[PDB]
RNA sequence: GCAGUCAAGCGUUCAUAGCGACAUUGCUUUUUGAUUCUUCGAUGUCGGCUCUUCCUAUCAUACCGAAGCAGAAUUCGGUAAGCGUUGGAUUGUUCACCCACUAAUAGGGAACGUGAGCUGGGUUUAGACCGUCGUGAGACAGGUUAGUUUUACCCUACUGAU
RNA sequence: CUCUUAAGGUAGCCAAAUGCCUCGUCAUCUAAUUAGUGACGCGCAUGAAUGGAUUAACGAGAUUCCCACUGUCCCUAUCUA
């Protein structure tokens, strides 16, 4: 039982994200570029794996 | 009734447990659902004793007790006799078996009325278990597996012995003891019985790896 | 059933490349032959067979010009080397064929005992003929008859001494004689007196269904050195040579058999035998001091093949004591 | 440890390490144990690893059915000669090194004890108990 | 008279002995940690085989050595004391080589069981990198 | 030896969860080389043992992120070198290959750490044997055996003491 | 039949103090052995008074293993001149 009313809730803080793949950083969707000085900022982004 | 639990995560609860109708043993080992093996099953029937005889926790291997009386071993002490005599009942006598052994659950198999012995028992202990509890006493074998308080559980109205036990000799024990048994194992086929399980008039406990197979011919041989 | 392939049609032609292609599916026929009489026997029975092409095809080679061959055969146990698919293979072509078959290594067997192995024959129709391997070296009206008695050629189980009996004709050795039976290979031809002519026979084996598990085969067929049981082999050496004989030839006293119940019983087997005997050899282990007995079955073992110790078969079935020393 | 270890102990003094040829009290055939190496046992440069009463090794057998020898296998000591100090002060020892063949979850092999156990053991890995004879 | 333990039916001996062999063919078992399936190389032009590391066992297709080098090719199999490991015949052509393979296990306390179980050994051709460095040349020795 | 960019594709459909050729930009001095600048009026030269410290390109341990992560078990990555990283048969061995325990049995450097600290199994003298070559003396970086390992009481450094 | 100006490794024996590839292959010994023993030999390059092979006895010769033994070691400690 989670009705899923409230796992739009939960996924929207767990599985709403975008992922830098070249630093594996847990950042938001609408982002372009990475948030750390570490990457250098870059771009390559991509969206987290929610579906199989 | 065949109550499948767990000491604290072993099976043989004959070796950390005891049980008659009188009187029933435990160790100290937590885990209540243990506990709950006799606590659920009975009322205020009999007592429950938690006790560590010798600074020890088998109770089972170490006391070969009766409905009316008890075995504690020599290097046991006066500070757990006391309890073991204060919280049970007179009925019952506790004498400290002043022999050579100390296993006692693993050379007698004694249940009201009839025993089995291990053979190169003392003489005085031979005369001193009738003396404190009048059963008699046929010190041979099991099938030459000279222990027997592990390779033997013993009610009144039913036993159990292990698979290796000769057609000859499951017989020759029916005719001792006039009840019947089967070469029955324990908790997925280990045949340590006397110690893998216990049992009573009416009550069974055995460990919680146990199977059906074995819980359906225990719910008959031991019962009636 | 089947222990030998046919060989048909040569047919005085050409075509190296392809008439002996013909052999080649004559051995995938063959082979298809003992797959099917291993799989129709339980699951397991192994035969000491050959898979190698080239050593059959060897033997193709070795009796169509030979033209007339004489079987030898270990009077030790010929149950076991007689050969079987011959009778119905080397008659068919109508030419220079018919074998004889004979038994030899026959000096190891006491006079009227040799009987026993005389008589299994004249019963059955069996031609045969007893002449030795080691010991010559240069219908009852025969007892026993010395190497008196167009190619020629000659056929062994393994280790017949087809290079031990080559002095049959003129004895010097052109053909080294060795403990291991696997060195004879790449056949061989010997060639004296301008009208008989020998074709030597390079190394064979011989399956077989019975006495396969349980049995005593390592008595001529296998080598002794690279064996990693040691101990079923042996199991049969427990069995018959009586314990009060060997304990008086080699001078030990091993035992006397405390474990007289069913486990062990009497006439020891291969575990209790040999535990007091490298002990008393001297030969222990690497690592610790125990009896290396896998060691001393190699050694006692390769003395009852040698010479020094002796066992002869019954021929045809279950009797208690036929041989005696 | 805990490989069938039911309880958990205090620290008995090491008496037999690695190398030590100790016999064997069961009914299983064997006579002795070679012990090769023992579980927990951590790490130190140049320093052979130990057994304690009641501790698990794994050891090989030198002495009897070859069955058995030629193979590593899980053993359980039971009696020691290095003197060692139960809590109530008072020091023990026997008078033979003695062990037990058994399963890698502590469960045994053969059919009895031929000797005393010790307390450390018997109430650490159960069914030692289930064939002990005599504890002590 | 005892009663499997598993199915409840058959009765077994006092000789020692565990639930049904119905039971202990399909539940129990002594062979897993093995692949049925063992690749290895091969080199046509210099027809010899290698283990994956190690010399070129040189011996031919269909020989006795085939035992050890595949005995070699490392499984569980070198724990529980193997007996007559014999080949079965397959086609040559099919490139694979078949060995049945005998076990003898221990059961849950001392009662040892036969097995009848197979494995396959399957060849994939080489480009016979080594021999091919000796036929090109970078420096003399 | 180590790492990175393209991404032609592999990856049940799914370039980049992991992987990734065709090419390409680099890093290192723990490999083998190349060169001959220093030392030929000698810097005591292999390995092992003992012992201290440091490095990170982290095997384990701590908090974490990321997956074709349901759980368990695993793979990739990051902060991070604070604390650990073994006993043994064989080999003179560096290297190695196994057995076993283990949280783990990571890689490395300090004149290829350390011989007025040790050992001398080895190479690398003289004795001597075998094989091949050489007419021969003799040669072999081919195999086998035997073969002296020196001194600190001075300055510094350090441990301790006035 | 022969080719090389003569002959063409016979008996025997071995990865052996002779074998580069070599930690050769197999078996055995061990928990595990590049060592060791036996066996196999197209033997790079064994071999017959440049002596071959086998040998009881002997050896401050070289090597492997084992029973016993022990501070060699685990792991150091102590006593005396
Ligand atoms: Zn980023
Ligand atoms: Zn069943
Ligand atoms: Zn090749």
Same mark, same amino acid.
């Given at each position: ?52 | ?224 | ?27 995938? *026929?063959?082979?298809?032959?003992? =797959?099917? %009489?291993?799989?129709? !026997?339980?699951?397991? @029975? +192994? $035969?000491?067979?050959? #898979? ?39 008659? *068919?072509?109508?030419?220079?064929? =018919?074998? %004889?078959?004979?038994? !030899?290594?026959?000096? @190891? +067997? $006491?006079?009227?005992? #040799? ?51 080559? !002095? ?158 | ?136 | ?141």
């Amino acid at each position: 039982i989670i009705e899923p009313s409230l796992k739009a809730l939960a996924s929207k803080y767990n599985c709403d994200k975008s992922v830098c793949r070249k630093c594996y950083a847990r950042l938001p969707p609408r982002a372009t570029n990475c948030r750390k000085r570490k990457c250098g900022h870059t771009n390559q982004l991509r969206p987290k794996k929610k579906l199989k | 009734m065949a109550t499948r639990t767990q000491f604290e995560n072993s099976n043989e609860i004959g070796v950390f447990s005891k049980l008659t109708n009188t009187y029933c043993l435990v160790a100290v080992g937590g885990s209540e659902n243990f506990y709950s093996a006799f606590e659920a099953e009975l009322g205020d029937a009999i007592p429950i004793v938690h006790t560590t005889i010798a600074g020890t926790r088998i109770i089972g291997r170490m006391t070969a007790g009766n409905r009316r009386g008890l075995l504690v071993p020599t290097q046991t002490t006066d500070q757990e006799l006391q309890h073991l005599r204060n919280s049970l009942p007179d009925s019952v006598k506790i004498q400290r078996v002043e022999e050579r052994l100390s296993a006692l659950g693993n050379v007698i198999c004694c249940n009201d009325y009839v025993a089995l012995v291990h053979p190169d028992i003392d003489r005085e202990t031979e005369e001193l278990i009738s003396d404190v509890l009048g059963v008699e006493v046929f010190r041979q074998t099991i099938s030459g597996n000279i222990l027997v308080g592990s390779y033997c559980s013993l009610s009144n109205q039913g036993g159990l012995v292990h698979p290796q036990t000769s057609v000859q000799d499951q017989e020759e024990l029916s005719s001792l003891l006039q009840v019947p048994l089967v070469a029955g194992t324990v908790n997925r086929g280990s045949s340590v019985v006397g110690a893998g399980m216990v049992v009573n008039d009416y009550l069974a406990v055995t460990g919680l790896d146990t199977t059906a197979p074995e819980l359906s011919v225990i719910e008959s041989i031991f019962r009636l | 059933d089947l222990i030998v392939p046919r060989r048909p049609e040569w047919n005085e032609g050409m075509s190296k490349f392809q008439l002996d292609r013909q052999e080649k599916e004559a051995f995938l *026929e063959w082979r298809r032959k003992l =797959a099917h %009489l291993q799989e129709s !026997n339980e699951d397991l @029975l +192994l $035969t000491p067979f050959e #898979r190698n092409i080239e050593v059959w095809k060897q033997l193709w080679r070795v009796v169509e010009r030979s033209d007339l061959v004489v079987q030898i055969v270990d009077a030790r146990n010929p149950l076991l080397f007689r050969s079987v698919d011959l009778e119905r293979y080397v008659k *068919e072509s109508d030419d220079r064929k =018919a074998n %004889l078959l004979l038994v !030899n290594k026959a000096d @190891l +067997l $006491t006079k009227k005992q #040799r009987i026993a192995w005389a008589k299994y024959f004249i019963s059955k129709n069996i031609s045969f003929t007893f002449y030795s391997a080691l010991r010559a070296n240069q219908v009852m009206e025969k007892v026993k008859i010395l190497s008196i008695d167009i190619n020629i050629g000659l056929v062994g189980y393994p280790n017949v001494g087809k290079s031990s009996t080559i !002095n049959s004709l003129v004895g010097a050795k052109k053909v080294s004689v060795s403990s291991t039976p696997g060195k004879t290979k790449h056949f061989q031809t010997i060639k004296l007196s301008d009208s008989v002519m020998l074709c030597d026979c390079p190394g064979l084996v011989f399956p077989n269904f019975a006495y396969n598990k349980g049995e005593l085969v390592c008595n001529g067929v296998l080598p002794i050195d690279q064996l990693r049981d040691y101990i079923g082999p042996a199991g049969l050496v427990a069995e018959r040579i009586p314990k009060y004989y060997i304990e008086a030839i080699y001078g030990i006293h091993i035992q006397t058999k405390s474990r007289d119940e069913g486990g062990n019983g009497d006439i020891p087997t291969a575990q209790e035998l040999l535990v007091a005997y490298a002990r008393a050899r001297g030969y222990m282990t690497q690592g610790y001091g125990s009896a290396d007995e896998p060691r001393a079955s190699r050694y006692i073992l390769k003395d009852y093949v040698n010479g020094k110790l002796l066992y002869v078969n019954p021929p045809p079935h279950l009797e208690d004591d036929t041989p005696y020393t | 440890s805990g490989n069938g270890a039911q309880g958990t102990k205090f620290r008995i003094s090491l008496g037999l390490p690695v190398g030590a040829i100790m016999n064997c009290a069961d009914n299983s055939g064997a006579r002795n144990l070679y012990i090769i190496a023992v579980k927990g046992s951590g790490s130190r440069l140049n320093r052979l690893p130990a057994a304690s009463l009641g501790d698990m090794v794994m050891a090989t057998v030198k002495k009897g059915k070859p069955e058995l020898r030629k193979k590593v296998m899980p053993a359980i000591v039971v009696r020691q000669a290095k003197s060692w100090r139960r809590r109530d002060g008072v020091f023990l020892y026997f008078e033979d090194n003695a062990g037990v063949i058994a399963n890698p979850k502590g469960e045994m092999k053969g059919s009895a004890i031929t000797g005393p156990v010790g307390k450390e053991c018997a109430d650490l890995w159960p069914r030692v108990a289930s064939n002990s004879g005599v504890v002590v | 008279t005892l009663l499997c333990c598993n199915c409840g039916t058959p009765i077994d001996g006092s000789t020692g002995l565990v639930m049904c062999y119905d039971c202990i063919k399909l539940t129990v078992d002594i062979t897993q940690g093995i692949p049925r399936e063992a690749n290895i190389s091969f080199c046509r032009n210099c027809e010899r085989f290698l283990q994956p590391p190690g010399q070129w066992i040189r011996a031919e297709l269909e020989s006795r050595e085939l035992l050890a080098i595949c005995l070699r090719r490392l499984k569980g199999l070198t724990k529980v004391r193997l007996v007559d490991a014999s080949f079965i015949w397959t086609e040559p052509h099919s490139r694979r080589i078949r060995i049945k393979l005998t076990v003898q296990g221990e059961a849950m306390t001392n009662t040892i069981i036969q097995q009848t179980f197979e494995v396959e050994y399957i060849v994939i051709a080489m480009q016979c990198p080594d021999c091919a460095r000796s036929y090109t040349t970078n420096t003399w020795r």
